[PDB]
Structures are given as structure tokens and as C-alpha cells.
A paper describes a structure:
Acid sphingomyelinase (ASMase, ASM, SMPD1) is an enzyme found in lysosomes and in the extracellular space where it catalyses the conversion of sphingomyelin, a major component of membranes, into ceramide and phosphocholine. ASMase consists of an N-terminal saposin domain and a C-terminal catalytic domain. To gain insight into the molecular mechanism of ASMase function and the interplay between its domains, we determined crystal structures of the full-length protein from mouse that reveal a conformational flexibility of the saposin domain. In one conformation, the saposin domain adopts a globular closed form independent of the catalytic domain, while in the other conformation, it assumes an open V-shaped fold that establishes an extended interface with the catalytic domain.
To assess the significance of this interface for sphingomyelin hydrolysis, we measured the activity of interface mutants on anionic liposomes containing sphingomyelin at acidic pH to mimic the lysosomal environment. The interface presumably stabilizes the open conformation of ASMasesap, allowing it to dock onto membrane surfaces, and possibly deliver lipids to the active site. Closer examination of the interface revealed direct contacts between ASMasesap and active site loops of ASMasecat, hinting at a coupling between lipid binding, interface formation and catalytic activity. The structure of isolated ASMasecat is unchanged relative to the catalytic domain in the open form full-length protein, but analysis of their crystal temperature factors indicated that interface formation reduces catalytic loop dynamics. The location on open ASMasesap responsible for membrane lipid docking under physiological conditions likely includes its hydrophobic surface, which in the crystal is buried by a symmetry-related saposin domain reminiscent of the ‘handshake' clasp observed in saposin B dimers.
Author numbering: 76 to 609
Write the structure that this text describes.
């Protein structure tokens, strides 16, 4: 219904035909091998790390990345839409998207009330980033050329240098199974616990040679070891980013067949059946997230933060609220608000590391349900730190805080560690909020020492060391700016940051202001949050 006397519509289908031809030529197996076998020769041409890795890294990524480009950019409706305009398609890739909040008016912000005298306190264990390395070996080179050392294939160290420790090593290494058994055995004094939050990243960083059997092997092995030492204590876990292979590869639910992540989510639903109820397992299989009620007046929500990860290449195809998760979260929160319940959110990748649009909608959801939210717990960063949320309009009022627990693994150059949270206990009228938290470590210098002992000691208690009236958002907000001025205090945070094993290089003024900026930045791509630091 368009009027012309010079236009040739020969260019619109010529585009569609031509890209449609590419895809058919890329799927051909004899062509895929051509794109792999050349890659080995290219890693020498681009001055890349050991080529032996390249012969493996590019192999696993190829089939999945290609499919994503054919389904995203080289999709006829997508590419031709970029060149010729709305006439021959639409360019949807990484388009901005929003979420709709319910029509329910937002209640006035009510600060939680301090716990009454004689109010019980519950202890919550927090395991994150275990990263079991089946191929960990003692005495092997910790400074190999591969991305991951201390394992079979990294060879032995030269000049009679000191090999890898028996319990781990300060380097780009992961943990042997024994060191995780030691962690779970020494939970006597740190307990008792009412429940455990377990935010994934079970398999090691040997991403280049991870079959699906090795990923399910790590799943059931550790899930069996954890259930063994926690007994009747329920463990509520979340999906990490090393759980699938290839790493970070989590195709949303709309993708079907062998290439979907059904192989993973359905194996989880079997390993985690003793912990999760029926309705929770349903959504677990589909998209790897779920919600449940661990105790009266509290709602637990486990998000699959892979559907926000830059590293998840499958999100090109459609990066709008993958799996409908944010829409589902809003429904869960809003329902809780009506019930008068509070909510705990657990995930792997902190919201500050997500895609800009995803993170901005999460940030606005938190603010809307500030009164309903009682805790946010995440991991991934392998480090002890936090992220403060502010009001969407002015970015001046702290209204929620997310705790990024440090990792059980040594990757990279850290002490093993775990984290126990003290929360307002199980009783009607409880705020369910975090009251304080404790961090335990395994000083490797001691354990690996001759005749050493594997003793898990408490590194510190949160309020005690930082002198905090409470674990509310306003107290961490104050702490950050306190460290902006007090150098000794920051060096304490810096020391605990790395679980008590700081780097050799001192952290100067530009390194400090950057690290504090991270604590205020729960919204990705938002420099205004650090206007007061620099
Ligand atoms: C890219 O993905 C976007 C994300 O949506 C997901 O992506 C696709 C691939 C599917 O996997 C889909 O299941 C995912 O949710 C996508 O934008 C989103 O599109 C969906 C629909 O495709 C919108 O979801 C909701 O649709 C329902 C329809 O009724 C449901 O009920 C029936 C009967 O029980 C069931 O059989 C189904 O579950 C049906 O889905 C709407 O009812 C719902 O309304 C919401 O909003 C109103 C506001 O008036 C609220 O009051 C309600 O409580 C609901 O919360 C949704 O419309 C979804 O809204 C939409 N996203 C946004 C942000 O709007 C996009 O289309 C994809 N793009 C491309 C090019 O493929
Ligand atoms: C320029 O040409 C393209 C290509 O379409 C084809 O090319 C012409 C030379 C003629 O031979 C056409 O008969 C022929 O379709 C046009 O794109 C095409 O648009 C139509 C509708 O806009 C698409 O058809 C739809 O198909 C669905 C599913 O069957 C139906 O439900 C719809 O009712 C509708 O029929 C067609 O798929 C699409 N072609 C491709 C390859 O995607 C384009 O519209 C044309 N330019 C103008 C200005 O008309
Ligand atoms: C996504 O949201 C942005 C901004 O948030 C919305 O708009 C604010 C102005 C305010 O009304 C908030 O409560 C909303 O949640 C949208 O910004 C719109 O931008 C258009 C043009 O881009 C502009 O003309 C309007 O001022 C804004 N609002 C409306 C209703 O159009 C943005 O359009 C939304 N969509 C996307 C894809 O980003
Ligand atoms: C389902 O897929 C797996 C994986 O193989 C394919 O190629 C991988 C490199 C991956 O990137 C995806 O493109 C594909 O799914 C198949 O298992 C592989 O093949 C055998 C299994 O017996 C084994 O030697 C390989 O190591 C497996 N690879 C991995 C990464 O686990 C499996 O056979 C496929 N299922 C069906 C029915 O074909
Ligand atoms: C971890 O253990 C090592 C070894 O026992 C401790 O290192 C000692 O620390 C102080 C100096 O800071 C002195 O006792 C010695 O000079 C250090 N010895 C060595 C070999 O480094 C270390 O302090 C412990 N750290 C923690 C957090 O437990
Ligand atoms: Zn005319
Ligand atoms: Zn990790
Ligand atoms: Zn991670």
C-alpha cells in the first residue's frame, strides 16, 4: 500500500534469501569443523594463550555461538530490518525493555523494628562458589600457563619450587574434594543452622574440557556431600554460571531439544528433591528458579541470575525478561506484600553485574518492595563485599542491601571461606532481616604447613569489627563513606575483602575509590552512584 515509481523491491528479498543461505551453509557439519580446525592456527596468529586450550575452548563454544548468531543477527527478519528499515524486519537485539508494576499503591516505607529483648535469633549457613576440581593434585605447578593450575596437566614446578598445597593453593587453582569435606565437618561450632542457602558454581574453572557428564558428576557429588553433613537441615540452592556447559550457556525455556538446558534443570530437580517442595521443582525444571516458604511469614525466592549475565550469549536472540523471571518475581513479591510476608532473594550473580536493562528493572522492583524485602544474598564475585540499593528517583536513601558472600574456593589467590548469617528468628512479628553475619576461613599457610591441621576458624564478626549499630542498609552506607576518609578502616575491609589474604600490591587512592564505588553500585551502568566518592 506504498506509492512509488522508481523503487525496486528486488533488494528486500535478496537480503532475506542471502542470509537464509548463510545459515544453511553454517549448520553443515563439514563446515563447522572448518571453523574449528582453523581456529587452532589462528590462536598462534593472534598471540593467544596455550594453543592446546584453544583446540578445546573454541570447540565447545562454536556450535552454540553459531546458532545464536543465526538466530539473532543473521536471522533474516533481524538483519534485513537493520539495513532496509521497518519494511523488511525489525532489529530486536539487546533492545531496551521494561517491566510493569502492579496497580497496587506502594505503602509508606516502614523501617523494620529492632528485635525485642528475648527475641530468638536464627543462624543461616551460606555456601557459595565451591568450585570442586576433580583433577586437583598435590605438588603440581600452581603457576602453569593454563587458566587453571594445581591439577593434572599443569605439570610439575621447576627448580624444586614449592608445588601445590595439599588443601589448596594461593593462585588460579580450585579445591580438592577433601577440602570441601573438611568444610562441612567443621560446622559443629558454627551451627546449629535452621536452613542453608547454596548459590551454585559447583564445578571448577576447567571450562575448556567440561562434558555434560562432568557437570552432572559435580552436581550429584557435592549435593550428596552437602546433604550428608547437613542432615535434616533444608538446603535451598540457586543456579550458578559454571553449572552448565559451555560456561555461562543457559538458553531460555523457549529453546527446545538437546541444546536446551533441560539436561541440567531436570537433574537438579532430582538431586534437590529432598529439599524443595513439588511446586518449587516445577519451575526449577523449566527455568532454574523457584520460590517456597521456609517458615511462617517468610518467602524464599531463588533466581536464575544467568538470565541477566553479559556472559550468556544465548540472550542475543531475545534479551527481554528471559524466562519471564522478573514478571514472575513481581508476582511473588506482590503476593507476599498482600499476605504481610517478608521475602529473601538468593541468587548467584549480583544485580550490579547484570545487563543494563535487566539490572535497572530489578533495581526498581527492589525499591517498590522495600518493605516486603528482608534480605538479598548473592555470590559469584568470590569476595566479601556488599551492594547498597537506593531510591530510584534521587539515589540518596538506602532502602536495601545485598550481601556478596566470599567463595569457598581459592580462585584466585584467596583463602577458602564460608559465611553464617544471624537473622531475626522464627516468630510472629519477626522482621526476618539480617542482624549480623560471621565469616569463617581456612588459613592455608597453616593447613599446608608441615604437620599442618585443617582448622576452620572464624575470621571476623560483622558489627563487631566495623562498629555497626545494625546490619541495615543505612549502616553499610555510612560504612562506605567512613572508609572514604578513614584509611585504616578501609585496609581492614580490604583485608577481609580477600578473606584475610590481601595482594602484595598496595591499594592506593584510585584502587580504593573504585572498590568503594562497587559497594554503592547495585545498578549496572550508573556512574551517578559514585558522584560522592570522586
Ligand atoms: C521476548 O521475550 C519477552 C519475554 O517474554 C518471554 O518470552 C517468550 C519467548 C515466552 O517464553 C514467554 O512465555 C515469556 O514470558 C516477550 O515479552 C513478553 O511476552 C509475553 C508473552 O509472549 C508477555 O507475557 C504475559 O502474557 C500473558 C498471557 O496470558 C497467559 O495466561 C495463559 C492462561 O493461563 C497461559 O497459557 C500463558 O501463561 C499466557 O502467557 C499476560 O496475561 C501477561 O500480562 C501481564 O501484564 C499484566 C498487565 O496488564 C499484568 O496485570 C499481569 O499480571 C501479567 O503480569 C503478559 O503479557 C509479557 O508481558 C511480555 N513482556 C513484557 C515486558 O511485557 C517478547 O514478546 C519476546 N520478543 C520476541 C520478539 O519474541
Ligand atoms: C518485497 O518482497 C518481499 C519478499 O516477498 C516475496 O517477494 C515478491 C517479489 C513477491 O514474489 C511476493 O509475492 C513475495 O511474497 C516481501 O516480503 C514478504 O511480505 C509478505 C507480507 O508482507 C510475507 O508474507 C506473509 O506471510 C505470512 C505467513 O504465511 C502470512 O500470514 C501473511 O499474510 C503474509 O502473506 C512474506 O513472508 C515476505 N517475504 C519474505 C521472504 O519474508 C515484501 O513485502 C515486498 N515489499 C513490499 C513493499 O511489498
Ligand atoms: C521504559 O521506561 C522508560 C522510563 O521509565 C518510564 O518512563 C518514565 C518517564 C516514567 O513514566 C516511569 O514511571 C516509567 O516507568 C520509558 O521512557 C519513555 O521514553 C519515551 C521515549 O523513549 C518518552 O517520550 C517518555 O517520556 C517516557 N515514558 C513514556 C510512557 O513514554 C521508555 O520508553 C520505556 N520503554 C523502553 C523500551 O525503554
Ligand atoms: C546432546 O549433546 C551432547 C553434547 O554434544 C553436542 O556437542 C557439544 C560439543 C555441545 O556443544 C552441543 O553442541 C551438543 O549437545 C551429546 O554428548 C556428547 O557426545 C558424546 C556423548 O556420548 C560424548 O563423547 C561427548 O563428550 C558429549 N559432549 C558433551 C559436551 O557432553 C549428546 O549425545 C547429545 N544427545 C543426543 C541425543 O544427540
Ligand atoms: C595465617 O597463618 C600464617 C602462618 O601461621 C600467619 O602468618 C604469620 O602472621 C604474623 C604476621 O602477620 C606472624 O605470626 C608471622 O610473621 C606470619 N608468618 C608467616 C609464615 O606468614 C598469618 O598471620 C595468618 N593469617 C590469618 C588471617 O589467620
Ligand atoms: Zn503514482
Ligand atoms: Zn564462582
Ligand atoms: Zn560465578
Amino acid at each position: 500500500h506504498h506509492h512509488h515509481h522508481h523503487k525496486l523491491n528486488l533488494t528486500c528479498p535478496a537480503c532475506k534469501v542471502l542470509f537464509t543461505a548463510l545459515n544453511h551453509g553454517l549448520k553443515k557439519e563439514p563446515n563447522v569443523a572448518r571453523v574449528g580446525s582453523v581456529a587452532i592456527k589462528i590462536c598462534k596468529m593472534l598471540n593467544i594463550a596455550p594453543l592446546d586450550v584453544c583446540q578445546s575452548a573454541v570447540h565447545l563454544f562454536e556450535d552454540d555461538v553459531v546458532e545464536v548468531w543465526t538466530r539473532s543477527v543473521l536471522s533474516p527478519s533481524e538483519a534485513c530490518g537493520l539495513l532496509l528499515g521497518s519494511s523488511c524486519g525489525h532489529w530486536d537485539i539487546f533492545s531496551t525493555w521494561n517491566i510493569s508494576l502492579p496497580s497496587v499503591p506502594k505503602p509508606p516505607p516502614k523501617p523494620p523494628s529492632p528485635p525485642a529483648p528475648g527475641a530468638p535469633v536464627s543462624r543461616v549457613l551460606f555456601l557459595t562458589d565451591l568450585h570442586w576440581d576433580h583433577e586437583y593434585l598435590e605438588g603440581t605447578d600452581p603457576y602453569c600457563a593454563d587458566p587453571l593450575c594445581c591439577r593434572r596437566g599443569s605439570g610439575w614446578p621447576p627448580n624444586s619450587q614449592k608445588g601445590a598445597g595439599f588443601w589448596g593453593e594461593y593462585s588460579k587453582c580450585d579445591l580438592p574434594l577433601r577440602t570441601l569435606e573438611s568444610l562441612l565437618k567443621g560446622l559443629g561450632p558454627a551451627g546449629p543452622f535452621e536452613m542453608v542457602y547454596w548459590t551454585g558454581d559447583i564445578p571448577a574453572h576447567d571450562v575448556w574440557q567440561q562434558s555434560r557428564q562432568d557437570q552432572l558428576r559435580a552436581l550429584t557429588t557435592i549435593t550428596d556431600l552437602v546433604r550428608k553433613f547437613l542432615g535434616p537441615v533444608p538446603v535451598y540452592p540457586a543456579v550458578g554460571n559454571h553449572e552448565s556447559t559451555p560456561v555461562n550457556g543457559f538458553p531460555p525455556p523457549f529453546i527446545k531439544g538437546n541444546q536446551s538446558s533441560q539436561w541440567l534443570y531436570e537433574a537438579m530437580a532430582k538431586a534437590w528433591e529432598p529439599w524443595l517442595p513439588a511446586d518449587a521443582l516445577h519451575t526449577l525444571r523449566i527455568g532454574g528458579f523457584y520460590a517456597l516458604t521456609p517458615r511462617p511469614g517468610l518467602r524464599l525466592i531463588s533466581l536464575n541470575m544467568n538470565f541477566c549475565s553479559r556472559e550468556n550469549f544465548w540472550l542475543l536472540i531475545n534479551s527481554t525478561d528471559p524466562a519471564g523471571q522478573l514478571q514472575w518475581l513481581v508476582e511473588e513479591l506482590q503476593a507476599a506484600e498482600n499476605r504481610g510476608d517478608k521475602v529473601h532473594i538468593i541468587g548467584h550473580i549480583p544485580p550490579g553485574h547484570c545487563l543494563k536493562s535487566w539490572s535497572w528493572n530489578y533495581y526498581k522492583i527492589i525499591a517498590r518492595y522495600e518493605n516486603t524485602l528482608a534480605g538479598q544474598f548473592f555470590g559469584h564475585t568470590h569476595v566479601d563485599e556488599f551492594e547498597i540499593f537506593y531510591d530510584e528517583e534521587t539515589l540518596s536513601r538506602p532502602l536495601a542491601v545485598a550481601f556478596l558472600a566470599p567463595s569457598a574456593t581459592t580462585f584466585i589467590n584467596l583463602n577458602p571461606g564460608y559465611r553464617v548469617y544471624q537473622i531475626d528468628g522464627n516468630y510472629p512479628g519477626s522482621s526476618h532481616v539480617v542482624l549480623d553475619h560471621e565469616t569463617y576461613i581456612l588459613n592455608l599457610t597453616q593447613a599446608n604447613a608441615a604437620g599442618g591441621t585443617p582448622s576452620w576458624k572464624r575470621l571476623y564478626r560483622a558489627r563487631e569489627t566495623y562498629g555497626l549499630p545494625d546490619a541495615m542498609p543505612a549502616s553499610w552506607h555510612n560504612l562506605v563513606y567512613r572508609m572514604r576518609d578513614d584509611e585504616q578502616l578501609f585496609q581492614t575491609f580490604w583485608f577481609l575483602y580477600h578473606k584475610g589474604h590481601p595482594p602484595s600490591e598496595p591499594c592506593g587512592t584510585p584502587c580504593r575509590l573504585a572498590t568503594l564505588c562497587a559497594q554503592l553500585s547495585a545498578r549496572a551502568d550508573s556512574p551517578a552512584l559514585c558522584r560522592h566518592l570522586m
